[PDB]
Design a protein around this ligand. Structure first.
Ligand SMILES: CCCCCCCCCCCCCCCCCC(=O)OC[C@H](CO[C@@H]1O[C@H](CO[C@H]2O[C@H](CO)[C@H](O)[C@H](O)[C@H]2O)[C@H](O)[C@H](O)[C@H]1O)OC(=O)CCCCCCCCCCCCCCCCC
Ligand code: CLA
Ligand code: CLA
Ligand code: CLA
Ligand code: CLA
Ligand code: CLA
Ligand SMILES: CC(C)=CCC/C(C)=C/CC/C(C)=C/CC/C(C)=C/CC/C(C)=C/CC/C(C)=C/CC/C(C)=C/CC/C(C)=C/CC/C(C)=C/CC1=CC(=O)C(C)=C(C)C1=O
Ligand SMILES: CCCCCCCCCCCCCCCC(=O)OC[C@H](COP(=O)(O)OC[C@@H](O)CO)OC(=O)CCCCCCCCCCCCCCC
Ligand code: HEC
Ligand SMILES: CCCCCCCCCCCCO[C@@H]1O[C@H](CO)[C@@H](O[C@H]2O[C@H](CO)[C@@H](O)[C@H](O)[C@H]2O)[C@H](O)[C@H]1O
Ligand SMILES: CCCCCCCCCCCCO[C@@H]1O[C@H](CO)[C@@H](O[C@H]2O[C@H](CO)[C@@H](O)[C@H](O)[C@H]2O)[C@H](O)[C@H]1O
Ligand code: OEX
Ligand SMILES: [Cl-]
Ligand SMILES: [Cl-]
Ligand SMILES: [Fe+2]
Lengths: 33, 36, 56, 137, 334, 171, 97, 37, 244, 200, 30, 33
């Protein structure tokens, strides 16, 4: 299929950017006293 | 081009004169030990 | 598809053999010898003093 | 391989007589060539006119033929163009223009024969390296 | 205090996060000028007629290059050693075509990098240090002067200065070897000994100090927390390190004086890079590396090739191909 | 070295580039650390030649880490503040660089070169006005191969007639 | 289609002989007596409609005609190739050694 | 210079992590067809 | 008062045609039996105009102004040749020899560099008939040759050229040649250009004429790799007539 | 202060010997680098003109004039790579120069044989040679034993000027430190940096 | 895309210089 | 230029994946007692 050439990067960042944001906040919460 | 030439000449002369007068302004005495 | 085996001959009818590219070479000159390895034809770089060209 | 008599036998003139040089005059010829000629004719080319070299086959087609000792010596006395039409001593080193080419001043006849011998022997040794230029370096 | 005395105290202040100083009042505008122009030129400059032959070379990212092939192309061969500032051009488009940005960058850079050396002297003086870090920096500085200024001067054109890019650097190196046989020049060879030895000695000193670190930490933490900034005690056992390395080689091969050891670490790559810089700067005047082409001759007079003769073939291939449309006469003279 | 330029375009290889950075970065660290120690020394004796003021049994640091740190933080922006990390980094830099170059050479064992950038070759083939320093280097490489291969690889029995050798004008 | 005109001319008599209309002057060294005097005159008075028109260059001596008549077998004439004659390439075509 | 007293610790509990990741992955799965188009 | 090289060097005056004082509104009598000669013709371009290419077929194909980027390297000078009085008292100028070409690059709005070989090579320019005196109304009109901007030894960046070089793209050893054919096969163009020299000032005593010119010729086609642009070149001229 | 002065003078002498043919006459020191490159263009101009070439109208491969072209200010100059050396002035070349640079009528008619000999001599004695004194380019074979005095004098004096610059920096820094009293190291009791406010 | 990518990575490096200089962990004498 | 279609995503992930790894470890270190 002839898909948008930017669809892969758009999807990959749409996943990865807020997912890593949540992971950062989760992990630093667990490490608090 | 002439206005740019004069602007650079002025700017360059300004910084060169800061360097020369600044090193003339008692530079050996600006040290942590012998402030003579 | 295989195009088939190319056999090169000069105007005198003698079979020439293209010197094959060794793997070291990103690019290689086209040089054609007889069966005794004497250069008979080539694709020259400088054309002005060329003696071995395919046209000649 | 050695530097035999048969390597050192070169045509003396154009009629057919040869001379066999000694190894001492070959080596004096190479020394005198280097001193007087090699600045323009290193390796048998000609830096200031690359169309003409010192290959024996080119010297043979010169007018008069220069592919023998007597022809080469005469060139060093009275150099000409490749067709023998213009004398070129005012721009090429020679004994008649030794005032303007001072390295030509004290060259004797034995020195010119030695240089002429070196020019004729060296292609028999070097093959196509002599007069071939940087392709054969 | 008058305004001048207040300004001088600011300029020479050791409390500034980055030290300005009198060299800094030259270094800062010059380096900012060279940086800004470099960044804009590397991204966006149009093609430059480096060889003076109306054959412009594309150096910038917008004109088709990547990070590796992109460069600020040297100024035109038609300009030679002539000073080509913006005001000498009839327009920016002409300045760009002729490689104006290169002259602007390297001139500001070299002036700026010279003042970086002075600034290193200056701060060491203000801090009560010994003054010779700047002498160490004079090695890469001289190297930069060699490739950007001295080489062009001896060759007669800023078109022969090293391009400001990665592939441009490689082009400079290959042509240099073709024309000067730099690999066969002992100054370059000392440069190599300076840099291989320097990397060797860097590895050696790093490894021996790290091997002899005194235990102050457990296995679950980085041993680097065993050192506290500004602690008075030595953090490694130099007697243990000497005892190792003097048994690795022999006892008198090994430094037991840390001051001697660190001087050697300074002096080896610095002296070696000085020879490298002098190599380039003397090949600027065409005193070339060793020529052994046809040095080995048999009894008949046949040339017997050596490895130097194989180098010459490679040198010939670069020479006949470089600047392939620029030469009109048989000898490449400058 | 010249074989690897002409046949492998080894200067273009990012693994070699990492090697160069480790070697040159290593020599830089060697020069700068030596010079920094020698110029932040404590005055531990009366001689103007300062090597005698060291004793290997001393417990004290022979040079001021604090002054060195302040110097480099103000000159260059950043500075070492941990002597152990400093000396490890001196191990790490030339060692990593040499390992990176080794990986590149392993690739070159199989002729897996970083010889060309495909996008520039497509463009240069179709646009005879597109020229870069990378394209110029490829021509240099073609000269190296042709002019050196007959004598460098005499088992091949290359006869390259003079008319097939690539040459620019005049030379 | 699109053809290299210099490569095509090597398929003519230019590839085998001295073309009086096209060949660079240094090829006259190949035979006795032509260079540089007769070669200069031949290149200057070109184009020719046949080889035998080379004996009509005016001012030639009698021995000069005899040289040319010996060498008519080594000469040819083709069409003037502009790629070979422009830029002064008949006098210096950038080929040296 | 005295530190800033307005600073506050930030938290994200595990269920909030799982909910957010669910949200981001489902939006990705939903919009991916439209991004490829 | 007459300048030397040391006065001229670096000033840009070397790229200028020589001028004539305003007093020189004279006339140069052409004796119809004498042989005349141009001892020095100099053309100094002042304006380069390039015709745009509307992708439409139609539109106004106007000549647009361009900026010179190759500096004061533009004038043709020291051109000589016979000035042959004809039957009808028309003069024809046959260009023989001189510095009769200059590569020029101009740049258009947007950054397109346009290279051209500004030339009057093999100029044959003629006047009107019945001209017994070269006057301030004489107009030479003529045609010249524009050879290829690069000659046959020129190598492209991939080492392709006409009389030298590769004939293929060596970087793409297995690409289809038939679309690379325009870039692979180099072609030497040879076109005609058209010039009109308008006499404005005659020193009738000395024989120095001066005026303006307009020249129309194609730009470089890059050995046939692309289509050339029509270029109009306008400037000033100086000529000096001398009885041979 | 003297070391700074001597370094500057060393660098100036390097340029004097490399470029100046007046106080370093070419008949004693050989041609300059610019002089030899100009002598080559002249030599092949003369040879090709003798063969019948129209030198002012010969196009090189790039389109610039093969023998003659214009400098960036319009002066008629030799072509090829020696375009960089158009500011060269020498007594063998100045008789061919007019008001507009190289005069094409003088070039056609007034080159003397002494100029042809001088151009050929200078072209073949360019200051290019190897460290073992093999004359010519790096690609040349052994034969000619030549390295120009100008190359020997320029290279030597660059080396000397550079190390004297290094010596200036060494001695100027040391004299500053020794006058202020810290040339032997930091005094452990009054280390200056410990009395300074931290940078951050 | 290529040019944007290279400039982006470059710009991040310059930003990292800024933080590494002006927002370093301060060297503390202890 | 005709570049690799996966070069953008390859570069974006080569940046973003280890960068976020380091950010995660940095942030949770700062939040420890
Ligand atoms: C490995 C261990 C190295 C040794 C460690 C110590 C480092 C010192 C380096 C010296 C090495 C010793 C070798 C001595 C042999 C030598 O040199 O031998 C060479 C000559 C003796 O050889 C003669 O060398 C001559 C060199 O040519 C000279 O003479 C020719 C004939 O007259 C031509 O005129 C030519 O133009 C001109 O260069 C000829 O070749 C003769 O045939 C041959 O006999 O000695 C000389 O010259 C005498 C020495 C010259 C003094 C040096 C001053 C020159 C400084 C120039 C600096 C420039 C900067 C250098 C940057 C690189
Ligand atoms: C520290 C400040 C500084 C310095 C030293 C330079 C230096 C330079 N600039 Mg740059 N420039 C600067 C800041 C500076 N610039 C700034 C802030 C801008 C933005 C406005 C520019 C924008 C700019 C442009 C656009 C260009 C330059 C150019 C130049 C070069 C030529 C200048 C010239 O011809 O002046 C003439 C010199 C003088 C008027 C000298 C007077 C100095 C005193 C009074 C005399 C003493 C001289 C003597 C050497 C003693 C020196 C002291 C010594 C003993 C320590 C020169 C390398 C040009 C260039 O790069 O060309 C390639 C160019 O095109 N500059
Ligand atoms: C800025 C210039 C520069 C720099 C710094 C480097 C740096 C490097 N090059 Mg590169 N090179 C460059 C330019 C540069 N190159 C250019 C322009 C080219 C042309 C394409 C090359 C072509 C090139 C090639 C072909 C190779 C390198 C390699 C290397 C690496 C060598 C590592 C080493 O120390 O090997 C030295 C050898 C060793 C460390 C092995 C151990 C040696 C033992 C221990 C020595 C034992 C000695 C013994 C005790 C006594 C001996 C007796 C004595 C008398 C001698 C290093 C990363 C090499 C590489 O990548 O390898 C992975 C390599 O093969 N380079
Ligand atoms: C200005 C200084 C200078 C210059 C330009 C020359 C130049 C020349 N000399 Mg002379 N000469 C000199 C000083 C100089 N020399 C000195 C000081 C001596 C006493 C040793 C001589 C004794 C001498 C003799 C006996 C002969 C010459 C010859 C020659 C010619 C060929 C040289 C050669 O082949 O070098 C070979 C190249 C080298 C040996 C390389 C040397 C590299 C040096 C040592 C590097 C210097 C670096 C620096 C000073 C130290 C750095 C250390 C650092 C830690 C600070 C050449 C014209 C020859 C000649 O042709 O005579 C007619 C000849 O036979 N020279
Ligand atoms: C190895 C050490 C060494 C050697 C062998 C040389 C050798 C040389 N140097 Mg170098 N020099 C050196 C180190 C060395 N230098 C160093 C370390 C520096 C500082 C970096 C220099 C800086 C330097 C400069 C700036 C110059 C030289 C020059 C020279 C050359 C001529 C020297 C001369 O005549 O001075 C001059 C001699 C004196 C000053 C002594 C007094 C002489 C009196 C005044 C002469 C009066 C003559 C007069 C006509 C009398 C007539 C009387 C009348 C009534 C009949 C000579 C080849 C010159 C050169 O050729 O440049 C390329 C030159 O310009 N040197
Ligand atoms: C290579 C560059 C360079 C550097 C980094 C230094 C560094 C130093 N010099 Mg030295 N100096 C040099 C070359 C250099 N020098 C040269 C060639 C000479 C001979 C003229 C001198 C003569 C000299 C004297 C007389 C003195 C110093 C002193 C010093 C020291 C103290 C600061 C000072 O007063 O500097 C002065 C700086 C200079 C004289 C020139 C610095 C050159 C760089 C490039 C800065 C130039 C900036 C300039 C304004 C730019 C002009 C641009 C242009 C477009 C106009 C410091 C270590 C002093 C000292 O304490 O000695 C114990 C001192 O009294 N130097
Ligand atoms: C868009 C635009 C314009 C593009 C940019 C233009 C352009 C062309 C970009 C260049 C691209 C570029 C970056 C390419 C290089 C890529 C490259 C080759 C990558 C190498 C990558 C890599 C992993 C290499 C492997 C080997 C390796 C680890 C090398 C690292 C080298 C390295 C960083 C060395 C350190 C250098 C350095 C300056 C350190 C200074 C340290 C310093 C402050 C010491 C001071 C100091 C000393 C003391 O002794 C004491 C006591 C104290 C206290 C003290 O402080
Ligand atoms: C001469 C070249 C200078 C050598 C030093 C260069 C390194 C600078 C590094 C950065 C500064 C590093 C640093 O700060 O160094 C400082 C270090 C010790 O300083 P001190 O103050 O103890 O002594 C120096 C003076 O104060 C005199 O006492 O200096 C010395 O060791 C000087 C040695 C000179 C020894 C005499 C010169 C002979 C050595 C050269 C021989 C080379 C052979 C080459 C063969 C190819
Ligand atoms: C350059 C300055 C030269 C020096 C020194 C020597 N020669 Fe030469 N040589 C030179 C040129 C330009 C020419 C061509 C002249 C022409 O227009 O015909 C020559 C020619 C010769 C020849 C003839 C070559 C041929 O094929 O016929 C010979 C045999 C010759 N030169 C010999 C020679 C000798 C022995 C020299 C040393 C004493 C010598 N030449 C010096 C340029 C230069
Ligand atoms: C390049 C062109 C200029 C050439 C200059 C040469 C002129 C020679 C005389 C210049 C006078 C320099 O004189 C110098 O001036 C400064 C500033 O005015 C004086 O005044 C200074 O006092 C002290 C040190 O003394 C500094 O802390 C202070 O900031 C400064 O004002 C110096 O003590 C005096 O030595
Ligand atoms: C590409 C996408 C990347 C997006 C990146 C998102 C970055 C998000 C940054 C989150 C920063 C949290 O910032 C961090 O907060 C924690 C608490 O929450 C603080 O931590 C502070 O409070 C905690 C709890 O009271 C203490 O245990 C700790 O000692 C104290 O420093 C850190 O000092 C601060 O640095
Ligand atoms: O620019 Mn750059 O590289 Ca120095 O040698 Mn001559 O000039 Mn060009 O040919 Mn080779
Ligand atoms: Cl190149
Ligand atoms: Cl040239
Ligand atoms: Fe250390």
């Amino acid at each position: 299929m002839e898909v948008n050439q930017l669809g892969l990067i758009a999807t990959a960042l749409f996943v990865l950017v807020p997912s890593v944001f949540l992971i950062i906040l989760y992990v630093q919460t667990e490490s608090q006293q | 081009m002439e206005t740019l030439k004069i602007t650079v000449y002025i700017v360059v002369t300004f910084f060169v004169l800061l360097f020369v007068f600044g090193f003339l302004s008692g530079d050996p005495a600006r040290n942590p030990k012998r402030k003579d | 598809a295989w195009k088939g085996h190319a056999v090169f001959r000069n105007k005198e009818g003698e079979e020439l053999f293209v010197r094959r590219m060794p793997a070291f070479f990103e690019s290689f000159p086209v040089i054609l010898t007889d069966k005794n390895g004497v250069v008979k034809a080539d694709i020259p770089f400088r054309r002005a003093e060329s003696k071995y060209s395919f046209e000649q | 391989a050695e530097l035999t008599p048969e390597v050192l036998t070169v045509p003396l003139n154009s009629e057919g007589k040869t001379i066999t040089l000694t190894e001492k005059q070959y080596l004096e010829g190479k020394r005198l060539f280097q001193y007087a000629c090699a600045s323009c004719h290193v390796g048998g080319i000609t830096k200031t006119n690359p169309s003409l070299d010192l290959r024996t086959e080119t010297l043979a087609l010169a007018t008069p033929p220069r592919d023998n000792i007597e022809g080469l010596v005469d060139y060093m006395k009275n150099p000409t163009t490749y067709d023998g039409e213009q004398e070129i001593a005012e721009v090429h080193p020679s004994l008649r223009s030794a005032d303007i080419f001072p390295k030509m001043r004290n060259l004797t006849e034995k020195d010119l024969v030695a240089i002429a011998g070196h020019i004729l022997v060296e292609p028999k040794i070097l093959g196509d390296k002599w007069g071939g230029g940087k392709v054969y370096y | 205090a008058n305004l001048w005395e207040r300004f001088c105290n600011w300029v020479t202040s050791t409390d500034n996060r980055l030290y300005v100083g009198w060299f800094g009042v030259i270094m800062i505008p010059t380096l900012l000028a060279a940086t800004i122009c470099f960044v804009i030129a590397f991204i966006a400059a149009p093609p430059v007629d480096i060889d003076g032959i109306r054959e412009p070379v594309s150096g910038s990212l917008l004109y088709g290059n990547n990070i590796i092939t992109g460069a600020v192309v040297p100024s035109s061969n038609a300009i030679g050693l002539h000073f080509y500032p913006i005001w000498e051009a009839a327009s920016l488009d002409e300045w760009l075509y002729n490689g104006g940005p290169y002259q602007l960058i390297i001139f500001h850079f070299l002036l700026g990098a010279s003042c970086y050396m002075g600034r290193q002297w200056e701060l060491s003086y203000r801090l009560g240090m010994r003054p010779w870090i700047c002498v160490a920096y004079s090695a890469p500085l001289a190297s930069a002067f060699a490739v950007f200024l001295i080489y062009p001067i001896g060759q007669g054109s800023f078109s022969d200065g090293m391009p400001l890019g990665i592939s441009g650097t490689f082009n400079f190196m290959i042509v240099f070897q073709a024309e000067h046989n730099i690999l066969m020049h002992p100054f370059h060879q000392l440069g190599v000994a300076g840099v291989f030895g320097g990397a060797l000695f860097c590895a050696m000193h790093g490894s021996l100090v790290t091997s002899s670190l005194i235990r102050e930490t457990t296995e679950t933490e980085s041993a680097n927390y065993g050192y506290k900034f500004g602690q008075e005690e030595e953090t490694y056992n130099i007697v243990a390190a000497h005892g190792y390395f003097g048994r690795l080689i022999f006892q008198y091969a090994s430094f037991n004086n840390s001051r001697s050891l660190h001087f050697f670490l300074a002096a080896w790559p610095v002296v070696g890079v000085w020879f490298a810089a002098l190599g380039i700067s003397t090949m600027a005047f065409n005193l070339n590396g060793f020529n052994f082409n046809h040095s080995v001759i048999d009894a008949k007079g046949n040339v017997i090739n050596t490895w130097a003769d194989i180098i010459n073939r490679a040198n010939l291939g670069m020479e006949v191909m470089h600047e392939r449309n620029a030469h009109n006469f048989p000898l490449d003279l400058a | 070295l010249l074989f690897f330029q002409g046949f492998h375009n080894w200067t273009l290889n990012p693994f070699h580039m990492m090697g160069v950075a480790g070697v040159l970065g290593g020599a830089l660290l060697c020069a700068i650390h030596g010079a920094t120690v020698e110029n932040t020394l404590f005055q531990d004796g009366e001689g103007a030649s300062t090597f005698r003021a060291f004793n290997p049994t001393q417990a004290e640091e022979t040079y001021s880490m604090v002054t060195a740190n302040r110097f480099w933080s103000q000159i260059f922006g950043i500075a070492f503040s941990n002597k152990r990390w400093l000396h490890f980094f001196m191990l790490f830099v030339p060692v990593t660089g040499l390992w990176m170059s080794a990986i590149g050479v392993v690739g070159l064992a199989l002729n897996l070169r970083s010889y060309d950038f495909i996008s520039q070759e497509i463009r240069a083939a179709e646009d005879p006005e597109f020229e870069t320093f990378y394209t110029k280097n490829l021509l240099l490489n073609e000269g190296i191969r042709a002019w050196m291969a007959p004598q460098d690889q005499p088992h091949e029995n290359f006869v390259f007639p003079e008319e097939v050798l690539p040459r620019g004008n005049a030379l | 289609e699109l053809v290299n005109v210099v490569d095509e001319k090597l398929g003519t008599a230019y590839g085998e002989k001295i073309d009086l209309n096209n060949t660079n002057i240094a090829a006259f060294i190949q035979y006795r007596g032509l260079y540089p005097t007769l070669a200069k005159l031949i290149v200057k008075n070109a184009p020719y409609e046949s080889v035998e028109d080379v004996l009509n260059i005016p001012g030639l001596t009698e021995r000069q005609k005899q040289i040319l008549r010996e060498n008519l077998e080594h000469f040819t004439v083709t069409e003037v190739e502009t790629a070979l004659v422009e830029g002064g390439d008949r006098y210096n075509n950038g080929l040296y050694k | 210079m005295e530190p800033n007293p307005n600073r506050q610790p930030v938290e994200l509990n595990r269920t909030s992590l799982y909910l957010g990741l669910l949200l981001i992955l489902v939006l990705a799965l939903l919009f991916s067809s439209y991004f490829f188009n | 008062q007459t300048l030397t090289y040391d006065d001229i060097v670096g000033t840009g005056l070397a790229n200028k045609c020589p001028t004539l004082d305003d007093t020189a509104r004279g006339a140069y009598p052409i004796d119809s039996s004498q042989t005349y000669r141009i001892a020095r013709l100099c053309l100094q371009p002042t304006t380069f105009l390039v015709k745009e290419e509307p992708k439409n077929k139609r539109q106004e194909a106007e000549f647009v102004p361009t900026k010179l980027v190759t500096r004061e390297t533009t004038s043709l000078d020291q051109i000589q040749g016979e000035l042959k009085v004809n039957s009808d008292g028309s003069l024809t100028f046959v260009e023989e020899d001189g510095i009769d070409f200059q590569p020029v690059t101009v740049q258009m709005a947007g950054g397109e560099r346009i290279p051209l070989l500004f030339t009057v090579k093999n100029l044959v320019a003629s006047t009107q008939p019945n001209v017994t005196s070269i006057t301030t109304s004489t107009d030479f009109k003529g045609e010249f040759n524009v050879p290829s901007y690069r000659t046959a030894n020129f190598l492209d960046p991939k080492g392709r050229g006409l009389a030298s070089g590769y004939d293929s793209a060596i970087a793409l050893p297995q690409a289809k040649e038939e679309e690379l054919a325009r870039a692979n096969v180099k072609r030497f163009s040879l076109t005609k250009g058209q010039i009109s020299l308008n006499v404005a000032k005659v020193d009738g005593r000395t024989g120095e004429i001066a005026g303006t010119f307009e020249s129309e010729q194609l730009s470089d086609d890059d050995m046939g790799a692309h289509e050339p642009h029509e270029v109009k070149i306008q400037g000033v001229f100086y000529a000096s007539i001398e009885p041979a | 202060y003297s070391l700074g002065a001597l370094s500057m003078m060393g660098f100036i002498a390097t340029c004097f010997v490399w470029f100046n043919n007046t106080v370093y006459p070419s008949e004693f020191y050989g041609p300059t680098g610019p002089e030899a490159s100009q002598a080559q263009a002249m030599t092949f101009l003369i040879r090709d003109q003798k063969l019948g070439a129209n030198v002012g109208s010969a196009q090189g491969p790039t389109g610039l004039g093969k023998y003659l072209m214009r400098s960036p200010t319009g002066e008629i100059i030799f072509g090829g790579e020696t375009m960089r050396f158009w500011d060269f002035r020498g007594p063998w070349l100045e008789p061919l120069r007019g008001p507009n640079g190289l005069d094409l009528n003088k070039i056609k008619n007034d080159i003397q044989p002494w100029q042809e000999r001088r151009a050929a001599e200078y072209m073949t004695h360019a200051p290019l040679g190897s460290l073992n004194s093999v004359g010519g380019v790096a690609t040349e074979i052994n034969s000619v034993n030549f390295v120009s005095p100008r190359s020997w004098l320029a290279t030597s004096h660059f080396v000397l000027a550079f190390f004297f610059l290094v010596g200036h920096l060494w001695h100027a820094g040391r004299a500053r430190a020794a006058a202020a009293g810290f040339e032997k190291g930091i005094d452990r009791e009054s280390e200056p940096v410990l009395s300074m406010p931290s940078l951050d | 895309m290529e040019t944007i990518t290279y400039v982006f990575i470059f710009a991040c490096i310059i930003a990292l210089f800024f933080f590494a200089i002006f927002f370093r962990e301060p060297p503390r004498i202890t």
